[PDB]
Amino acid sequence: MKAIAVKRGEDRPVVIEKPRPEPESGEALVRTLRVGVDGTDHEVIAGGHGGFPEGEDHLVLGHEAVGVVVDPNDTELEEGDIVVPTVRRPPASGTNEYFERDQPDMAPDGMYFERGIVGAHGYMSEFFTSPEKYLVRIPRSQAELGFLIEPISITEKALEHAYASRSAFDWDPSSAFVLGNGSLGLLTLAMLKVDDKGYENLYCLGRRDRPDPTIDIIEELDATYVDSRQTPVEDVPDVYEQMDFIYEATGFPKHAIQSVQALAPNGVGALLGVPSDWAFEVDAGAFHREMVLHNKALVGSVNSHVEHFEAATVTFTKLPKWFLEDLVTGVHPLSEFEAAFDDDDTTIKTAIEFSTV
Amino acid sequence: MKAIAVKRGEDRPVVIEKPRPEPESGEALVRTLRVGVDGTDHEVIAGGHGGFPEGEDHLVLGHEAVGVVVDPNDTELEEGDIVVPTVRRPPASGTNEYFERDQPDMAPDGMYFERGIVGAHGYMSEFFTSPEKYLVRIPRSQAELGFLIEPISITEKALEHAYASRSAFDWDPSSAFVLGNGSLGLLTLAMLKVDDKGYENLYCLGRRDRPDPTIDIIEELDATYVDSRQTPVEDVPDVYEQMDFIYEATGFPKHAIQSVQALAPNGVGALLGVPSDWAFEVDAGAFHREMVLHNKALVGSVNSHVEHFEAATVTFTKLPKWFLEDLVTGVHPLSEFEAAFDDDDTTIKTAIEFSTV
Numbered sequence A, B: 001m002k003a004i005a006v007k008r009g010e011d012r013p014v015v016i017e018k019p020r021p022e023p024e025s026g027e028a029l030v031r032t033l034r035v036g037v038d039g040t041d042h043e044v045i046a047g048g049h050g051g052f053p054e055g056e057d058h059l060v061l062g063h064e065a066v067g068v069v070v071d072p073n074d075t076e077l078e079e080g081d082i083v084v085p086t087v088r089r090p091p092a093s094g095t096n097e098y099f100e101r102d103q104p105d106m107a108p109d110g111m112y113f114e115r116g117i118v119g120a121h122g123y124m125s126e127f128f129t130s131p132e133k134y135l136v137r138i139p140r141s142q143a144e145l146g147f148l149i150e151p152i153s154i155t156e157k158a159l160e161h162a163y164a165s166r167s168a169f170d171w172d173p174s175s176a177f178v179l180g181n182g183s184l185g186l187l188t189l190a191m192l193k194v195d196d197k198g199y200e201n202l203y204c205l206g207r208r209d210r211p212d213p214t215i216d217i218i219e220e221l222d223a224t225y226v227d228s229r230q231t232p233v234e235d236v237p238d239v240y241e242q243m244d245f246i247y248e249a250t251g252f253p254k255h256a257i258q259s260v261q262a263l264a265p266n267g268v269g270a271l272l273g274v275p276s277d278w279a280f281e282v283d284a285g286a287f288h289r290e291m292v293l294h295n296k297a298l299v300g301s302v303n304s305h306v307e308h309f310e311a312a313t314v315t316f317t318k319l320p321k322w323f324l325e326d327l328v329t330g331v332h333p334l335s336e337f338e339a340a341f342d343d344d345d346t347t348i349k350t351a352i353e354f355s356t357v
């Protein structure tokens, strides 16, 4: 079968050939439909994040996948079920408490593999296998855009933890600020528009000149575009307002620290970005005083698990159809797979199509 | 009546005389028994925190008080009840949503007064009045050390919020690290020893040379003393272990940032210190990456409300008697009030006695 992989030393994704896998007991065989591409995949290709499987020359990419079950084997899945795989799997040493208690998303470094990212091959192959417990059934009609379920689930987890941090008092937020106009940030902005917390004012930070299709999406959602070149995060409360909820999706470390200054009293910032090393001079006193005297919280979040994927299927149905059309700028057949890794300003979310239902 | 106050421009606390107050409707008249002194009071005397009441030449100090009801007026309190007042009161402009919903501890700057700290006189007077709703009845036998209920309540709130931040997954901590060996830090260390979360290993950071009575208390609680001059917070995991829970009570901004490096995966730091301005070069990338990839949280907390004071009465009963004897290094009659504001290494928690039951 064909797969899309990065090879050690090499700079770009290439096609390789591998044998079709066979499911072991408790696993199903899945025929890949579509696999999404995101910022993390680019960071994996560049060497900034993740790592190869032990004793392998390559890493099959892709962690945002939707497929169809072709052989249920000895599982309770049915032939033709549409499934989305979770990303984390137990490491070489075997299972551990995080997997046994069904919270692998909380496992630390070295206690997991992430398919397509660290220590295990991803889903950009014609077929793959997975254990039934890591395959989430989704409604058949979400098959075409089912690669969005994984990134949606990322935000479902982040919101669960951020909101939990505010659960000891009566918190009623009205403003939300998304940092970053990538596919994760834009998806999250749309999710916040339909969130039960009832946000009245939405804002999204980027650094693009008009005309730009990410700006168009932000404004079409009735949100305000904030240009960080004009208004840095720390200055936002002077120009606009203090933000009850901040979701960071830039991977820029300055935003992790400065977000505290933009938060309203009793607010929380959720941090999702995978940053590079970076040192600078911080007013630590300002950071410290704001956190304490205004009862603020910062919560980091990575990965997601089954319940978050399930929640994502509900959120998906609430998203405007125009938004999903505008977000997904290209779905490319395997024959043109290279196009999916192009990253210019007009490329928002891409995917590679391996097969159709 | 006599009161202990700081006067504008002046450097030290002095005795002043004021008329005995009269309770309005819904208020009781309380005869002050004992009022504690803490780090915040010293910061108020120095001008680093708080502020005077509008149109007043002075501020009566003291926010940690226990008293006896002498006139219940038209309240449901009874003559002779032992009470501890809460600290926050509505500002000049009147009540607001935070007070109406019974969460004044969440009110931002300008939406509260704090008696003895900002905008309103404290409790270092022979008598004071308060609304019934802000007077917490405590068991009569806690009268002698009842000024500890307020600082205990501070930690009760901080723990509620920190633990709430971890409530979306199965968190079972085993290690806790208290930063600071002041009266708040030491009290909190003892509370953690009896906490239901079941901490096995306790640690407390200070910067004293032996012999020192704060070191003695830490070791007598079966905790490990960490000297920050030898082992800074960021290096603690190399020398000792990663900490599931960190409670910051130094007011040193470096600790607010560095605590993230000392946290175990999925851990939370609670920040309580009231810091001074301070800038330095931070590895922001390290901060950001740890928060995200290891699902960490930081929560700030200030003040406390009735439910926290109630909880404190239960915690009080669990604290070892030897510990309370060692923590309270002097209770001074009003005649020797100056002694209570002495701050040398051997002074831990002090109080001023105005009267006895």
Ligand SMILES: NC(=O)c1ccc[n+]([C@@H]2O[C@H](COP(=O)([O-])OP(=O)(O)OC[C@H]3O[C@@H](n4cnc5c(N)ncnc54)[C@H](OP(=O)(O)O)[C@@H]3O)[C@@H](O)[C@H]2O)c1
Residues within 6 Å of the ligand: A038, A039, A040, A043, A154, A179, A180, A181, A182, A183, A184, A185, A205, A206, A207, A208, A228, A249, A250, A251, A252, A271, A272, A273, A274, A275, A301, A302, A303, A304, B292
């Ligand atoms: N925590 C998790 O489990 C998890 C899951 C998914 C993704 N992530 C991380 O989340 C981040 C976003 O993911 P993504 O797929 O949306 O990445 P992306 O497509 O690269 O989006 C990042 C966006 O941030 C913008 N940006 C960067 N610095 C900025 C600045 N200083 N001011 C304003 N905008 C700035 C970029 O704008 P320009 O294009 O103009 O440079 C870009 O559009 C990445 O770091 C990714 O690794 C984490």
Ligand SMILES: NC(=O)c1ccc[n+]([C@@H]2O[C@H](COP(=O)([O-])OP(=O)(O)OC[C@H]3O[C@@H](n4cnc5c(N)ncnc54)[C@H](OP(=O)(O)O)[C@@H]3O)[C@@H](O)[C@H]2O)c1
Residues within 6 Å of the ligand: A292, B038, B039, B040, B043, B154, B179, B180, B181, B182, B183, B184, B185, B205, B206, B207, B208, B228, B249, B250, B251, B252, B271, B272, B273, B274, B275, B301, B302, B303, B304
């Ligand atoms: N959030 C709230 O509602 C609230 C409530 C109460 C108190 N607080 C704050 O909490 C903090 C502690 O209160 P407290 O009454 O316990 O104050 P404190 O008596 O002044 O105790 C602070 C302790 O921290 C130690 N310390 C300072 N810097 C250090 C460093 N770099 N390394 C190791 N130890 C260091 C000091 O040691 P040395 O004596 O050796 O200098 C001192 O013993 C203060 O900032 C106070 O304002 C906040």
Ligand SMILES: O=C1O[C@H](CO)[C@@H](O)[C@H](O)[C@H]1O
Residues within 6 Å of the ligand: A038, A040, A063, A087, A114, A117, A150, A151, A154, A274, A302, A303, A304
């Ligand atoms: O993009 C991602 O990066 C994360 C870190 O590799 C991983 O945990 C998530 O499953 C994935 O969505």
Ligand SMILES: O=C1O[C@H](CO)[C@@H](O)[C@H](O)[C@H]1O
Residues within 6 Å of the ligand: B038, B040, B063, B087, B114, B117, B150, B151, B154, B274, B302, B303, B304
């Ligand atoms: O020491 C304190 O400082 C806090 C800030 O002034 C105040 O809110 C608390 O009630 C008090 O315990």
Ligand SMILES: [Zn+2]
Residues within 6 Å of the ligand: A037, A038, A040, A063, A064, A150, A151
């Ligand atoms: Zn992704």
Ligand SMILES: [Zn+2]
Residues within 6 Å of the ligand: B037, B038, B040, B063, B064, B150, B151
């Ligand atoms: Zn106090």
